Design a protein around this ligand. Sequence first.
Ligand code: CMP
Ligand code: CMP
Lengths: 278, 278
Amino acid sequence: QAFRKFTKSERSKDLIKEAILDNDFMKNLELSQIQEIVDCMYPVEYGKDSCIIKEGDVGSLVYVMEDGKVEVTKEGVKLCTMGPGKVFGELAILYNCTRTATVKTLVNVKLWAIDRQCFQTIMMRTGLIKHTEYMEFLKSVPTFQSLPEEILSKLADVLEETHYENGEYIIRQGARGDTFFIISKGKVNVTREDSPNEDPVFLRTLGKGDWFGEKALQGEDVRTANVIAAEAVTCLVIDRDSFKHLIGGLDDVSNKAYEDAEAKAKYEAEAAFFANLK
Amino acid sequence: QAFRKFTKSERSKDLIKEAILDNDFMKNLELSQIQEIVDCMYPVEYGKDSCIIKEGDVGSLVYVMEDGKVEVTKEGVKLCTMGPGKVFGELAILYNCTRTATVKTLVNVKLWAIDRQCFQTIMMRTGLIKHTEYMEFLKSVPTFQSLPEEILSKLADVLEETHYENGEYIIRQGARGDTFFIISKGKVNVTREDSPNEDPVFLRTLGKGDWFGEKALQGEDVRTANVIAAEAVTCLVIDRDSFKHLIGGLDDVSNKAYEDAEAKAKYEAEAAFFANLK
Ligand SMILES: Nc1ncnc2c1ncn2[C@@H]1O[C@@H]2COP(=O)(O)O[C@H]2[C@H]1O
Ligand SMILES: Nc1ncnc2c1ncn2[C@@H]1O[C@@H]2COP(=O)(O)O[C@H]2[C@H]1O
């Protein structure tokens, strides 16, 4: 399914969009999401001296002022007035829907609104978009393309995107590591120092699609070589424990697979029975 | 189940017994079973020359007379009388057919009754009772005591109790067996015909708790030795195909099958990951 779009003027569309990009909470949303919210919102008007949001209320609507002026007050304390181009009523959505302040109108106003559902949903599409971009990325790299679909997709739901600047060491020869890295952007150099005062030896170079620190996923072990960024570098990463988890979460028994075990079992039970006798 | 006890006169309580002991379908019940029957029976004094059961009726009650006389007529043809004893009306309940005869009284009677359900239950209690006995018996033999509870209980639902007499061949060498025997009473001698026209060689004696003929459960076609009862013998018996059917449906076998399956899945998945790197 999908949501009911309310076709509006480009003027209003642009306005709604600026107000969002100007809101502490929503300025982070992905374009696709912002355009969605922009299309979901419908017009709402309130007369002068009308209470729109009352603190304590359990609310669902998020608004965008288009015209008029409102006044925000909390526990009786006037906080500010707001005019066109401002978002309000978005905060309750991340406090279990309990309004944190009162919003009364000073003149007749014209708002653009969206309900809790269209809102909470749209917001939710954040993890989905990530998974997509990640999946898209993983499937562009030969090695990870070959991986079965269950892990590849479950890997994409927990991976974190950490960053590095030219010159920073990502991992060092001799450290107690537990993080696996997949280069999504940049390039790095791997070096290892022979043993004593032997200047660091250059081993290989990795870049987009390459990876390193695999061993950390297979129990406690010290790194065999250093890995330093050789320019701006981005890495999708996952720590050992989280991995062990992902793996121990591959709840995917195949139809025929359960059948074969369904068989293996019977055989054993019978043989086990006769065993117990003589 | 827990039913109601219509406490009658000690005279009457000891009156029904005889009537029950006189029935082909009830002269086998356990002391307890009878006790109950006598207990849930309730007084149903009827009028003189009154009717009770009509051929074609759908049964629901079973009775035993106490102080009356009736005519178990039928096609109008007085097919006999019946005094304060003989149990009647049971036949319809057991075959669930339709009243066969058409009883009618001959004077102010004083018969007793019990509904289709209290009777139905008490009767079938023979099954649960034997299960228990069988269950108890197996648990008192170490080699079967160690078996899981599901197997012992399924086993008690199918095992049959059979008897032989001093000197009888239970198993004859070279025959085709389909049964496995567990000795619950007596002793047996196991001999083996070594070569033709030769004195069968003694192998061993088995007693309460021991067992013989397991091979048959594995499909062995021909028995390799004679098994002669050395005195009165009672055995619990089960046939190959019933055994194999039993085993194959154990819930403790499917649960251990799925787990073994989900564990291979998690393993296979991990190795697939590290096999993909290099
Ligand atoms: N200073 C402020 N304190 C609290 N809420 C404010 C303030 N300025 C604007 N608001 C808005 O007022 C809204 C009242 O309801 P919400 O808690 O849903 O969301 C709140 C914000 O969007
Ligand atoms: N000779 C008889 N033939 C048939 N039923 C009889 C006879 N004598 C007694 N009865 C009882 O009368 C009952 C009539 O109905 P039912 O078939 O339920 O069960 C029958 C027996 O319990």
